[PDB]
From Swiss-Prot:
Annotated protein name in UniProt: Obscurin
Function: Structural component of striated muscles which plays a role in myofibrillogenesis. Probably involved in the assembly of myosin into sarcomeric A bands in striated muscle. Has serine/threonine protein kinase activity and phosphorylates N-cadherin CDH2 and sodium/potassium-transporting ATPase subunit ATP1B1.
Post-translational modification: Autophosphorylated by protein kinase domains 1 and 2.
Self-association and partners: Interacts (via protein kinase domain 2) with CDH2 and (via protein kinase domain 1) with ATP1B1. Isoform 3 interacts with TTN/titin and calmodulin. Isoform 3 interacts with ANK1 isoform Mu17/ank1.5.
Compartments it resides in: Cytoplasm, Myofibril, Sarcomere, M line; Cytoplasm, Myofibril, Sarcomere, Z line; Cell membrane, Sarcolemma; Nucleus
UniProt disease link: Rhabdomyolysis 1: An autosomal recessive disorder characterized by severe and recurrent rhabdomyolysis, usually with onset in the teenage years. Some of the episodes may be triggered by exercise or heat; others occur spontaneously. Rhabdomyolysis is the rapid breakdown of damaged or injured skeletal myofibres and may require intensive care management. Muscle breakdown results in release of myofibrillar content into the extracellular space and circulation, resulting in hyperCKemia (hyperCK) and myoglobinuria.
Gene name as annotated: OBSCN
Family as reported in the entry's similarity comment: Belongs to the protein kinase superfamily. CAMK Ser/Thr protein kinase family.
Domain (Ig-like): residue spans on this chain: 8-91
Disulfide bond positions: C30-C79
Source organism per UniProt: Homo sapiens (Human)
Organismal lineage: Eukaryota, Metazoa, Chordata, Craniata, Vertebrata
Amino acid sequence: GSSGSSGPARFTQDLKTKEASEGATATLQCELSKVAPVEWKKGPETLRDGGRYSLKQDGTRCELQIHDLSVADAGEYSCMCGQERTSATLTVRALPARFTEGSGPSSG
């Protein structure tokens, strides 16, 4: 086919996310047509590596991380790469209101 020809990188594998609990750390994975600089986004605003966000680029793949997860973080993370773009709704489980008491083992 056609390979030897300059051009922008386009997503190949729809970006996906995982479901973690509050305080935990999420991990999103996404593939690309080729090694190209992308930019993660959490809405009408732009994000960046450093602070409370970790974005690693493994060749044609990008692994995003969100330390200290939260119920307010659960939204829609979009990633812009060249001309194409994708998004994935992150799942954040809210902590349990109360801590189950449990039960005691019966006796003979």
